[PDB]
Amino acid sequence: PTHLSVDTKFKTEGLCVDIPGIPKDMTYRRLISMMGFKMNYQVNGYPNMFITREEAIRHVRAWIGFDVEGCHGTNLPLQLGFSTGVNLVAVPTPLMYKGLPWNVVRIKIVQMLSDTLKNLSDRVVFVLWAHGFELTSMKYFVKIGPERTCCLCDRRATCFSTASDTYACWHHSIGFDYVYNPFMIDVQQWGFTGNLQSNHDLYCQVHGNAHVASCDAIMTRCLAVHECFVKRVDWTIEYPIIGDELKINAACRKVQHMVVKAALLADKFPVLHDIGNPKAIKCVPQADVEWKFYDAQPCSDKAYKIEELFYSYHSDKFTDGVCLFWNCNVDRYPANSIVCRFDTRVLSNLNLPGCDGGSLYVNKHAFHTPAFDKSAFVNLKQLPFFYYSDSPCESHGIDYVPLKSATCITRCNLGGAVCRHHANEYRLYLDAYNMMISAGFSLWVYKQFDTYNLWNTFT
């Protein structure tokens, strides 16, 4: 049990308005055949065009919602809609394109998928709410066969060209006309009552229904993300490294240690309340403070209510000292807080569109994150950049230009001239900090936080 058996039954009720007379008894084997594809009893890495929910979850970066609406069946034009927001009109002869024949439509499909997916995944997973026309339109832009590699590199092939008779991955497919060996999943097989809109609108108010194919494609992928990452959470699935994952994770650990250490030095809190990941470790192990932990897993649906986290009877006095919320998404932070909160609006290869304003942040594990909300930070202010260090000024062991900065809080800068070691550490810290901010993380702190209070820690 690794792939979806072609002999698995497929419920055809959702298909019978577009395909009247469709047999109630149907397998994937007969469905693929009805779509105009032949699998030839082939043991060459592609056992089924359709995949299991578990396989779809492992390949969430490949998800592309896809819907087809009858504009007017080989006689009428079709509107092809994708969760990228694109609508193409194919004639049989929110971006909306005029009607064109399939030979040109297929070139646009290959360009769109390659640009969307080259940095996300080695494949495409079409996420459907299958009614019939989308399945029968696939033969006009999809080719299947044995698993192949790119003609220009070692990656698996995702495109085919009829002009050159060659195969390419998403990076090398310019000029290619067929999508090759795509995967697909029909959400309608998961057991739902009622249509797409009624199921999507139960959990999301951010996507409307203009009645165009791309709106349905967006809602379909949204419902699939809600089912697989919001109401169901699996932090055991590992995802490949596709970008700056390791650097971002190291940067987050560096910034956390820096900020918490400086807040403890500047305001001398007797107690710190660490609210979040039940597996968290003291980020400033040498600090004098009474460190108290409170367990809260990442919220994937709505942000936690501070009344539930803190009230219903612990130190009990969360008002004493400082609260540390490092990626613990709450509705309204207390005024005595140090906060790291992921901004779901950020554009990156790690952050995928999510459900109800939220986003799916995929970095080693998949984390659906509730929508970023500026009102959560009304009791706090943005944490300004600063570098602090009490380590001795000594080079040990990279070219140099003297550093001049009001934000390098060191003994050497206090004395009037930043030493080489602290200039190197400052530049490294600034790089880690900028990496973390650009990845989507935002930092917030209690209003009394003032770096001017750090200078007297050098006496």
Ligand SMILES: CNC(=O)c1cccc(C(=O)O)n1
């Ligand atoms: C096996 N390859 C992958 O899982 C993958 C994922 C994202 C990007 C790329 C690439 O750009 O090659 N590859």
Ligand SMILES: [Zn+2]
């Ligand atoms: Zn390639």
Ligand SMILES: [Zn+2]
């Ligand atoms: Zn939605």
Ligand SMILES: [Zn+2]
């Ligand atoms: Zn120094």
